[PDB]
Amino acid sequence: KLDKASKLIDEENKYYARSARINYYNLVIDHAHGATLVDVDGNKYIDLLASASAINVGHTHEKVVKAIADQAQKLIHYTPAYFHHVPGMELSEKLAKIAPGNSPKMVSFGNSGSDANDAIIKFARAYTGRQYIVSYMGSYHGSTYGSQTLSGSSLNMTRKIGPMLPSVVHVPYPDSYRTYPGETEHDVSLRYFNEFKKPFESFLPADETACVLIEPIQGDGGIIKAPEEYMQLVYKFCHEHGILFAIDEVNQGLGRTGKMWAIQQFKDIEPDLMSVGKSLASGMPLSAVIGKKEVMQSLDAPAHLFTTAGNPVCSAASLATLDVIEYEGLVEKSATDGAYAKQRFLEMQQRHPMIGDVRMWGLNGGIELVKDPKTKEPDSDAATKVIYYAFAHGVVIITLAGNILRFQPPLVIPREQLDQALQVLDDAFTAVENGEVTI
Amino acid sequence: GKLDKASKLIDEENKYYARSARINYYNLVIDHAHGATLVDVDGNKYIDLLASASAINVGHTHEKVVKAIADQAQKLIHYTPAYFHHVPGMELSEKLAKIAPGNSPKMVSFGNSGSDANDAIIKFARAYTGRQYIVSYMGSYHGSTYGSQTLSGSSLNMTRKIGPMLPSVVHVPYPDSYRTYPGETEHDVSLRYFNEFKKPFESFLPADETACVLIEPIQGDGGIIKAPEEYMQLVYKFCHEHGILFAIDEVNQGLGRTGKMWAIQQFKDIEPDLMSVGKSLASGMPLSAVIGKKEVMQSLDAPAHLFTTAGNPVCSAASLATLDVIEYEGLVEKSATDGAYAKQRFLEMQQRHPMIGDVRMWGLNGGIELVKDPKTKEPDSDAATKVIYYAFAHGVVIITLAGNILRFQPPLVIPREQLDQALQVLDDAFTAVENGEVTI
Amino acid sequence: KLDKASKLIDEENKYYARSARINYYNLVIDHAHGATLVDVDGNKYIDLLASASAINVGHTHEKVVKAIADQAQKLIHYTPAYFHHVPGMELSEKLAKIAPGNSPKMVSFGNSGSDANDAIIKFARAYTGRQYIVSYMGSYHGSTYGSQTLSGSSLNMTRKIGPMLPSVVHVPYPDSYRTYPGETEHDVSLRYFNEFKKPFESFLPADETACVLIEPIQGDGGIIKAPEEYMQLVYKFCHEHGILFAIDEVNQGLGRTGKMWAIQQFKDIEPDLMSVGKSLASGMPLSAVIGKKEVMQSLDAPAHLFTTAGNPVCSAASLATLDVIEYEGLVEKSATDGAYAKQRFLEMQQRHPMIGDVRMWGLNGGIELVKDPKTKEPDSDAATKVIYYAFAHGVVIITLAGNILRFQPPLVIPREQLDQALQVLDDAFTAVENGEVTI
Amino acid sequence: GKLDKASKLIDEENKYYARSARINYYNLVIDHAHGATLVDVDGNKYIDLLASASAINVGHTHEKVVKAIADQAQKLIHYTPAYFHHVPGMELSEKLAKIAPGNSPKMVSFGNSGSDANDAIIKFARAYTGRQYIVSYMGSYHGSTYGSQTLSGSSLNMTRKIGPMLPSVVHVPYPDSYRTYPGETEHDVSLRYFNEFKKPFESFLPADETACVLIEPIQGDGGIIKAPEEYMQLVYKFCHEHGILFAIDEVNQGLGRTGKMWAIQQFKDIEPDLMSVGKSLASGMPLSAVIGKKEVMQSLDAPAHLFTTAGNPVCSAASLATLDVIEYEGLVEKSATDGAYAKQRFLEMQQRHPMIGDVRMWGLNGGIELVKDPKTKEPDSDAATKVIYYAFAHGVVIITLAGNILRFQPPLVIPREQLDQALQVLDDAFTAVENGEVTI
Ligand SMILES: CC[C@H](C)[C@H](NCc1c(COP(=O)(O)O)cnc(C)c1O)C(=O)O
Ligand SMILES: CC[C@H](C)[C@H](NCc1c(COP(=O)(O)O)cnc(C)c1O)C(=O)O
Ligand SMILES: CC[C@H](C)[C@H](NCc1c(COP(=O)(O)O)cnc(C)c1O)C(=O)O
Ligand SMILES: CC[C@H](C)[C@H](NCc1c(COP(=O)(O)O)cnc(C)c1O)C(=O)O
Secondary structure (H helix, E strand, O other), X not given: OOHHHHHHHHHHHHHEOHHHOOOOOOOEEEEEEEOEEEEOOOOEEEEOOXXXXXXXXXXXXHHHHHHHHHHHHHOOOOOOOOOEEHHXXXXXXXXXXXXXXXXXXXXXXXXXXXXXXXXXXXXXXXXXXXXXXXXXXXXXXXXXXXXXXXXXXXXXXXXXXXXXXXXXXXXXXXOOOOOOOOOOHHHHXXXXXXXXXXXXXXXXXXXXXXXXXXXXXXXXXXXXEOOHHHHHHHHHHHHHHOOEEEEEOOOOXXXXXXXXXXXXXXXXXXXXXXXXXXXXXOOOXXXXXXXXXXXXXXXXXXXXXXXXXXXXXXXXXXXXXXHHHHHOOHHHHHHHHHHHXXXXXXXXXXXXXXXXXXXXXXXXXXXEEEOOOOOOOEOHHXXXXXXXXXXXXXXXOEEEOOOEEEEOOXXXXXXXHHHHHXXXXXXXXXXXXXXXXXX | OOOHHHHHHHHHHHHHEOHHHOOOOOOOEEEXXXXXXXXXXXXXXXEEOOHHHHOOOOOEXXXXXXXXXXXXXXXXXXXXXXXXXXXXXXXXXXXXXXXXXXXOOEEEEEEOOHHHHXXXXXXXXXXXXXXXXXXXXXXXXXXXXXXXXXXXXXXXXXOOOOOOOOOOEEEEXXXXXXXXXXXXXXXXXXHHHHHHHHHHHOOOOOHHHEEEEEEOOEEOOOOOEEOOHHHHHHHHHHHHHHOOEEEEEOOOOOXXXXXXXXXXXXXXXXXXXXXXXXXXXXXXXXXXXXXEEHHHHOOOOOXXXXXXXXXXXXXXXXXXXXXXXXXXXXXXXXXXXXXXXXXXXXXXXXXXXXXXXXXXXXXXXXXXXXXXXXXXXXXXXXXXXXXXXXXXXXXXXXXXXXXXXXXXXXXXXXXXXXXXXXXXXXXXXXXXXXXXXXXX | OOHHHHHHHHHHOOOEOHHHOOOOOOOEEEEEEEOEEEEOOOOEEEEOOHHHHOOOOOEOOHHHHHHHHHHHHHOOOOOOOOOEEHHHHHHHHHHHHHOOOOOOEEEEEEOOHHHHHHHHHHHHHHHHOOOEEEEEOOOOOOOOHHHHXXXXXXXXXXXXXXXXXXXXXXXXXXXXXXXXXXXXXXXXXXXXXXXXXXXXXXXXXXXXXXXXXXXXXXOOOOOEEOOHHHHHHHHHHHHHOOOEEEEEOOOOOOOOOOOOOHHHHOXXXXXXXXXXXXXXXXXXXXXXXXXXXXHHOOOOOOOOOOOOOOOHHHHHHHHHHHHHHHHOOHXXXXXXXXXXXXXXXXXXXXXXXXXXXXXXXXXXXXXXXXXXXXXXXXXXXXXXXXXXHHHHXXXXXXXXXXXXXXXXXXXXXXXXXXXXXXXXXXXXXXXHHOOOOOO | OOOHHXXXXXXXXXXXXXXXXXXXXXXXXXXXXXXXXXXXXXXXXXEEOOHHHHOOOOOEOOHHHHHHHHHHHHHOOOOOOOOOEOHHXXXXXXXXXXXXXXXXXXXXXXXXXXHHHHHHHHHHHHHHHOXXXXXXXXXXXXXXXXXXHHXXXXXXXXXXXXXXXXXXXXXXXXXXXXXXXXXXXXXXXXXXXXXXXXXXXXHOOOHHHEEEEEEOOEEOOOOOEEOOHHHHHHHHHHHHHOOOEEEEXXXXXXXXXXXXXXXXXXXXXXXXXXXXXXXHHHOOOOOEEEEEEHHHXXXXXXXXXXXXXXXXXXXXXXXXXXXXXXXHOOHHHHHHHHHHHHHHXXXXXXXXXXXXXXXXXXXXXXXXXXXXXXXXXXXXXXXXXXXXXXXXXXXXXXXXXXXXEEEEOOOOOOOHHHHHHHHHHHHHHXXXXXXXXXXO
16 A cells, blocks of 8 residues: 555655655655546545645646657756746746736746745845835745745744844734634724734834735635735735735645636735746746836846756746646636535535634635634644545545645546545545544 | 847847846857757857856756656656655655765755755754854855855845845855965965954854854856865864864756866865755756755754755656766766866967966866956956857857856867867957957 | 023034934923922923933932942942942842842843843843844833844834844734723733734744843833733743743833832742843943843853943942832832822823823823723824923923823922822813813 | 952852953952052052053043032932933033044934944944945954944854844954064055955945944954054045945044044044944943934934933033043143053063063053064963963052953053053063963
């Protein structure tokens, strides 16, 4: 079942540092296609992680596979940091326009979402001439010294490595589930906007805040969407004070949320800056920061550039990846399957009381499990047990914040495989309730 | 116009793509390449003396690399090593552990770029030592991420308008063997620079609170300068006697570029606690790695250092094929031989062309420093611009460092006939510039 | 009436930086005694400010004046950084014992409360080996880069002078007066302790937090005392995580609150570190950091010291100051006149509904003005009128946060003077209601 | 008998007073003092050569200052200028703004210590220029507050255990004119050190982002080291050309200590943008001030920089008197005259005592650097210790700088008789060390 896989993981742990991996189970993938993973042992699973929302278009999509192998024969690499290639020129043009909004934009290439967010700090700082950056608790923007300082979802991203980047203030992200009693969405929006302002009313000058970076829906936080009114308040606040408005679309973008972009789950908001990564190259190492033209011109070279960034083989794969999304109606597909998945999960909650909250926007959801529906006490054990039952039954799914099931399969997932996956979870809950799982 | 398409395409790209993301030289829209041969969209062929900033050690589109890229992609394009495992990456992390310089057990951590690798060095060093301070050199380049960019010291536009930078970082002067004082021997240089090295430790920087010294055995972007043997030994000793980790940046000078596997092996008996790799690691595919002594790498918990796409299975395959080409075609030796060849050729050119003030070369990695007057050693950026622009017009691509130093880093697999063409174009370029035939 | 006063200030304003003063009145003091001020024109005023709670024992106190004169003849100054003098040895020993708690304590001198709070950062980091400091929004700790970074009461303390000291996190301070509908003190305490945790649950590791600095009662914030329950939750949390618990007694200490130390207004709380300043030497430049011996021995010379710090003249003045507090029973006097003062103001509140909130502990209080009781909207206009009517009727009083009247007279103030001052304040409110005062 | 009472008071103070707040030399428990005379609790007399870190330029307990203190204490012990005004402070701030070097209008701002004055400099420079980076020197001491301590560079214990320190700060070497390279002239020294000064600016530090350069015209803590005239001129010019404010620390070397009113007046026509004053300003009473060109001092709104006790009416009275005494007694001139004499006394000594490697002196303000051998210049801290204890046992109080440098900064009023007494004792000390007659 996992024999060949375990023998190898045990040799990788001698040579590969434990800091670079979050460990759940022994999974040594041989190959995969669409939403199906096959390990070296021959076990087939249904993928509900999509490699951390990096494979919206499914594993080894033939169009993407072909682009890669085609481009590799011509030019594996020549750095855009010095010269020019057709795939990159084409892709920067396309990203500049498909980004939300109608203001002219420019693009800057990276290898990872992390460096894209580092870029955001740069551009924001150089454009405004201000130094302070506001980010959110519960957020995750990367592992580079800039984007890690912004993050607030793991204490291990601060431990033993400080001091971090100076001039960063964190604020709390609106939690609509663990609220005070009798609190409407409007009250939640107003409460969290009060917290948002307190720093600006005490030690943090609004005139010296370069920007505010926010995930329209916090991924690592537990698929938490900020209330519509809250986003508007913060948005208005930024433009009223010269503070750039930046979004992290690294995880929640490219159709994940049932719209091209997660910020498009909101009314008429265009970001000054935004980070795109992961799925852009179907898992290949490509990222980008997109921004209003005037902001992207604020820096002179080489303020922000990487040798391997905007790799032609990777740019080709992103060009195919985007054609796949538009041509297979993946954005629209996600909104639909996300609505059907929500229904089945809301129905599961009528039978399984442990499922405290069902958050879902497109094929993008968080299934928050608790010990009691009225106390909302996190249940890491129920959640932990559910996934293992899933793994042993051909479904790969993980957790966020211990007790929340992370549901983010490839957007191209066939309906047959979704019902097949949604069933195994239905069983997992019963299996857990009837005390049948002991990890 | 030889560049009729290239110019038209760049005019559009400059509207959508930030200008800070590229150091502009020539209108070069590459269509395809192989070995040390590049072909633009207009059909013009060039000899590659830049190797995409030493990211193409084994030459463009090597069939083994191309094949590994195509084979691996079909089976699995990606699945993050930050959560799960794939065979190509398990194998590469093992190989990079043993081929790393020194004999101490080592562990590897993958990244995407040279920049994030050095960012990791800071963390691992800080985490292991329990100290916060980091020492790096002026004239260095470690990356474009907030950590590595703070360590760098080669471009004022890497500090400008993005401050404040990362705290607890101190810069020291890197030993310069060309612009020295009258009568200074190598021993004098080593001592003078080691003495500047100490000053901060003798004043405000506690040696006991310094997590590590990061250094380029040969500064690349700094103008291809090699630290004198004795200097490196003084520094290396000082670190050990004080519990400071000794880290090296091998992102540019590594993988057979200097004529050995690692630039550090040009120095006697030195094993680093931490080292950064990238670029040529996967023939230009985005893949880096930090490699350090086992006990250091273990000093951090997850997810202190990971990237979704770092250790990409396609890039891992690419890298294994790359490392195989270096071994099988004996590229390390070839660099040492053709390097030695290039060096003499350039030293002979210097005898006829006094604008060439200094010839620095180790493997097929060289800096040809151009100066107005050999006695004053005053930099001649205008001349070096002329040489390179003449070369471009004559089918040879080559850029500069620090304005006046010609950058010599072609793919290690370059055929002797093409190495000789390029050298002749360069020679011709020098004569052409002397006669005032080249206009910038 | 302000002739000589105004002519002198015009001449001063060409030479003294405007940032070195917050301007109220053309008040040039020639001399003073007890709670009576006398300007260079002959006008008399009752002091309700006490040089910012720096004159607890009253102006030109016989004991304190004589002490200063006698010491200046024997030795104006010798630095304790290098050599010893008797007045300093007695002071450092005495303070070490009159500090709250019975754990053994050591003392280190400074010149102002600012540098003492800078010391607290040093000693905390040193002892714990941790780098992160947690301070409060709405706090004021000093004008030195360390203490200024910890501060949170004026955006002008951050502007144009950054970057600030790294590894500092700001948490909100419990606000009893402006709460949400139907909140009890218990809800306030739990809410604010809930905000306090968020950072430790996201990006701030408790295990890497050296300390938490807090004012038992925020002075600059507006005489805001934190709920007993809150404090205990914080204090307990600190001990469970190895986080030192620091207090800033610079403003609210030395009997100001009706007990020796503002921290003693809470139950069984001994700080690991405490800053003292202001009134310790009757306004002479002298401060101190007092901590548990094990904490203070964590530093080697000269990590923290000052040339003029622990000055023999300012040490003598302090010894005499502490003698007055003890001999004249000023701690008890403050508790009593404070209890009395509070009831008088509570009584003024019932008759004057522009008094939104009456915060008082000992002879120190904030009298917050509002436009409407239900809204609790700040009424800066009214407050400014009151303080100008006051000055015009021989009473010197300033505001905190624009709308809060700062009631902090010398502890030795005579009941008659106190009553006359209170009566003028009563008249002021009545006058402002009748529309009789415009500046 | 001699220090028995002092050893019991000190044994008890060590239980309550932190060891970090004092540099321990001797069991000197002072009862009173006047001029350059110190008297312990046992009635022992000592000649003061430390002037309590040069905070007693006008001698201990000057009668005019004492009267100033007592008279004022009776009128008003304190009322903060942060909120209100008092005549003594208004007079002082006016006078400081005029006696400051240069003819450009100035504005003052009061603090309590040299430290907060230096933190203020950072603020003012950053606020005026809009730039963040500050440049200070190694071997410098500017204070114990987090800002000024970060600029400081004279002690490792001022950084240990307390970081991270204030960001955006770079340290540069100070010109050493004693431990030079063989054959170096003042010119050579000046150019070498100016060249080191530029390396950061030529590598990672953007000059257009450097708010200022803070410097001690003569380093006090460093060992009484004066920068060469030419060097200072070059740095001065560099600052003006790039908009970088030029700040000086006059806390230790100001108020007539060097033979001129300001240490910077030892150089030709150099007016600072910002400067810091303290110590002697108020004859030891806690008062400091930052002084700068008006336009610079107007770049902050309140309360960016203020202290409750800062500008205390008694301290200002003390300061006003101390300034009249300097003037009335011609102390500036006396520092130069008696400084020139003391310098010769020490040079005559150096002729018979070759352990005296260097005699640095400017006013009654010197550093007598003691070495093991004149050729090698190896520091002899052992000898220094012995000399200072021998001096202490024979009624002369004096301490060292950097372990091997004797610190010479008595009260400027020192009577010639006492000066010769002390001098003769230090001579006796050298002879005594020579003969191994002194054991610590
Ligand atoms: C442990 C979290 C893992 C690494 C991962 N974090 C992704 C992430 C990144 C990181 O971009 P890289 O990692 O591509 O540089 C940036 N921004 C957001 C919003 C992200 O969500 C995840 O969410 O699964
Ligand atoms: C202008 C910088 C250019 C592209 C490039 N320098 C890249 C570089 C990097 C960053 O590696 P990335 O860029 O993969 O993160 C890291 N370390 C060294 C020594 C490097 O030399 C050069 O040498 O031309
Ligand atoms: C150990 C050095 C001792 C304390 C002392 N240092 C004083 C000093 C200060 C500190 O000013 P404070 O101490 O008034 O804040 C600031 N600037 C210079 C040039 C100084 O020289 C000395 O000179 O002996
Ligand atoms: C604007 C606040 C003014 C100046 C003043 N603040 C004093 C203060 C200080 C400053 O101590 P210093 O300045 O002696 O170093 C430190 N800590 C607390 C709690 C303080 O309250 C006040 O309370 O009116």
